[PDB]
Amino acid sequence: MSLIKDQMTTKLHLEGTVNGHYFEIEGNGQGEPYEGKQSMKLVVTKGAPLPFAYDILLPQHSKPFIKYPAEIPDYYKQSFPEGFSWERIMKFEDGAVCTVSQHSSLKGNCFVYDVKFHGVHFPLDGPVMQKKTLGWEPSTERIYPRDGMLRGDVPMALKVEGGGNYRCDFKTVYKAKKSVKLPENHFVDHRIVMTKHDKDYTNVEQAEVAVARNSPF
Amino acid sequence: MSLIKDQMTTKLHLEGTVNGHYFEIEGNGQGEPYEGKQSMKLVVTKGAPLPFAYDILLPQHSKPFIKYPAEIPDYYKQSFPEGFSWERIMKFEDGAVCTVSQHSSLKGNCFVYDVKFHGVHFPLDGPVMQKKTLGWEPSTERIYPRDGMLRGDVPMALKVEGGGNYRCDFKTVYKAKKSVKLPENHFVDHRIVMTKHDKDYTNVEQAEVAVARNSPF
Amino acid sequence: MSLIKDQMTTKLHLEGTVNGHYFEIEGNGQGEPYEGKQSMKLVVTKGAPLPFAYDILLPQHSKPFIKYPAEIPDYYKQSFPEGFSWERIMKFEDGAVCTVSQHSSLKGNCFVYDVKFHGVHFPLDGPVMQKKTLGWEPSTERIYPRDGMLRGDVPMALKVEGGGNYRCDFKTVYKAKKSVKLPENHFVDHRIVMTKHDKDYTNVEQAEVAVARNSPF
Amino acid sequence: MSLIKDQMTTKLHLEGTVNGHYFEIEGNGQGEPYEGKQSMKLVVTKGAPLPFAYDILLPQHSKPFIKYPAEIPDYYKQSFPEGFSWERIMKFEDGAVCTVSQHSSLKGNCFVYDVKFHGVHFPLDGPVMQKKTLGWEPSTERIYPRDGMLRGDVPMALKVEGGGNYRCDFKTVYKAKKSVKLPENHFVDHRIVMTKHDKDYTNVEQAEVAVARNSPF
Numbered sequence A, B, C, D: 001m002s003l004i005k006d007q008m009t010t011k012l013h014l015e016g017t018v019n020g021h022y023f024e025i026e027g028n029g030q031g032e033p034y035e036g037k038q039s040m041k042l043v044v045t046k047g048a049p050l051p052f053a054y055d056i057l058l059p060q061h062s063k064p065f066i067k068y069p070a071e072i073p074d075y076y077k078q079s080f081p082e083g084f085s086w087e088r089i090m091k092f093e094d095g096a097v098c099t100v101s102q103h104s105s106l107k108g109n110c111f112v113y114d115v116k117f118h119g120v121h122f123p124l125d126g127p128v129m130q131k132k133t134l135g136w137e138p139s140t141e142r143i144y145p146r147d148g149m150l151r152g153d154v155p156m157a158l159k160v161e162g163g164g165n166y167r168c169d170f171k172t173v174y175k176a177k178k179s180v181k182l183p184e185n186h187f188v189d190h191r192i193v194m195t196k197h198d199k200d201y202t203n204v205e206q207a208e209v210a211v212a213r214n215s216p217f
Helices: A054-060 B054-060 C054-060 D054-060
Strands: A008-018 A021-032 A037-046 A084-092 A097-107 A110-120 A133-136 A139-146 A149-160 A165-176 A186-197 A203-213 B008-018 B021-032 B037-046 B084-092 B097-107 B110-120 B133-136 B139-146 B149-160 B165-176 B186-197 B203-213 C008-018 C021-032 C037-046 C084-092 C097-107 C110-120 C133-136 C139-146 C149-160 C165-176 C186-197 C203-213 D008-018 D021-032 D037-046 D084-092 D097-107 D110-120 D133-136 D139-146 D149-160 D165-176 D186-197 D203-213
Touching: A008 A037, A008 A054, A054 A097, A054 A110, A054 A133, A054 A149, A054 A186, A084 D110, A097 D097, A097 D110, A110 D084, A110 D097, A110 D110, A133 A186, A139 A165, A139 B139, A139 B149, A149 B139, A149 B149, A149 B165, A165 B149, B008 B037, B008 B054, B054 B097, B054 B110, B054 B133, B054 B149, B054 B186, B084 C110, B097 C097, B097 C110, B110 C084, B110 C097, B110 C110, B133 B186, B139 B165, C008 C037, C008 C054, C054 C097, C054 C110, C054 C133, C054 C149, C054 C186, C133 C186, C139 C165, C139 D139, C139 D149, C149 D139, C149 D149, C149 D165, C165 D149, D008 D037, D008 D054, D054 D097, D054 D110, D054 D133, D054 D149, D054 D186, D133 D186, D139 D165
Parallel strands: A008 A110, B008 B110, C008 C110, D008 D110
Antiparallel strands: A008 A021, A021 A037, A037 A203, A084 A097, A084 A165, A097 A110, A133 A149, A139 A149, A139 A186, A149 A165, A186 A203, B008 B021, B021 B037, B037 B203, B084 B097, B084 B165, B097 B110, B133 B149, B139 B149, B139 B186, B149 B165, B186 B203, C008 C021, C021 C037, C037 C203, C084 C097, C084 C165, C097 C110, C133 C149, C139 C149, C139 C186, C149 C165, C186 C203, D008 D021, D021 D037, D037 D203, D084 D097, D084 D165, D097 D110, D133 D149, D139 D149, D139 D186, D149 D165, D186 D203
């Protein structure tokens, strides 16, 4: 049994291959699950320095930290202690594709994250391989039940040098390891920021605010 | 020169072909452009009764009726009197595709809409050809400048009999016929409802509320 | 009843809208249905001069003219006299989409073609709107039965100025108006050429060779 | 320096995650590079028994074994001894996506393959998770130069129980580690067969024939 506390930690291990380059990342974070706020500090422990834009990894580093109104079932918080998995397809407008798969567990007051990240077909002259990205725009994700699990659809946008953007469609499927009450269609408004980085992004800190809601009308 | 009034009318002509079936629709509507509210009454004048779910047409029937905060440039309202065009790709999760193209002009206090609608690859046993849809869910559309024009990305969801949904990605490009001040990235929260229909949807009434905003945080 | 002759004519009417520009094309052609060879002469009768690359239209101008080995059922030839319809999605690598829908009938020794063509999201600086295309490469289309009808999948490539290419995925569905014997999986090797054009492509002649086959091993 | 011999061996290591399930495969094979023929024997060494259709892995297990006519440059054979990498996107018609990335080297007369495979969004009731596949159909892949590298586009089809198929678009990019002469547009006709398997596919043998060609006309 689990009663998620108003303060919880995170621990993350990510294995990635992007444009054939292997890397590993170790994360340690903290947040306020009921407030929809969290931060994480990350270290590239294998494959540094990364030859691609670190920004593509930010949204792969924590679904228990969404502020859910009492009226919308909280699929993520209800899954504990057994937890859940998620899988994501990232379709960039220049033909690049990432696939992501993730397991979320709970050890004491620490959520434990195990991530696989695979990125292919990044154009060598593109914003990702040329490291010309400048963080994600805020987003609104549609969350809805399907096939006894939960899906999330969000059109994402990376800021790029020159002041334009670079679009990526996220399709995510979230799977509880135990029976939980499914919500109805709703939305999550997100904002993810890289708060600090060293020169080659081997050391990064990032934060997210995420709040669930119904349509305003 | 144009000063859009707090009450304006709409007039629409749509030509469509879906799964090889030709049809035409005539619309007459009204709304409050600065309040983000409008309604329209439609008549299928050629190709009735429609052999497919009328719901796929609802979002092709009016961008001047978005409530824009003073702080976000209103691309649509600024385009008048010359107006704008839009083009949309609708990618359904069962492989069906619609393409839409539209011209918007202004005659007196009446916006005039001229629509081309093309739908292909609807599965014969699918919710659209089997008329098992039950209206659109609310949505949040990302609006952002690109290539001197405006784009909108929104993951849409049709309710279907049995209580599931049926997803459609909209990609829209909006093109002013004259120079206008482009906004920055923002969002439009939408809700579109079919308020009334006769038995075979030859006579439909529909309404939309649409409000532009920045991220809440 | 129909016995397709070793020489047959074609007559075509196409209505199109590309990047919001309306046009109509009238075609008259001829070929050798059992030899897989045909030609057609086309006139842009409305919307001339076309503001986009004519090449995108070539493959929308004739499935009875495929050389079918006796061992593979000929879905197209068997459909006559009632004929068939087809619908196509064209996904270009720069995000442009065309939808195509078509009816094929037979009047005497003349196949009669009625086409709807809709093209959206062509980038204004792209090879199509900048008329920098230099014809299609040859192709191999996979033909296979599904849902009591016939599908064709072919990765197409347009030659572009500078000597590169520009890819387009075709997904086609072919629907006989009467019961016919479905083939098994097979291939059609194609080559389509624009044999002549005037300066603004208002007058075009084109030819196709198409031969059905099994895998060579 | 390398002179590829008329008989060569293969050795392969693959790491995979499909629907969150980790596995590893070890391969040993042999073929006739100039004849376009090869075979491989595989062992699932971690993650056995696989909970998904083994068929999705067959085309990730060898580009030096294509019969190239003298008139078409052989990008793969020319890359040795330094070799090449490839990256693939597999888009299934039911929304599942695999990403694949690969390094090919040469040690003595043995090609050495190092593969990463990531599969997400396989529907739990789909042919892959329900192990209802019955091998790949033959295919024709378009091979063409882009961005100083080589691309391959092929619409693939998996046979499924009941006698239908299940389509997957492959987009592959091939990157030589050294300067080589690029070919022009051409085709590769393929046939891949699983020649033997034990009950849970922990032990598999497979073979491929692949021949490059120009258009027949």
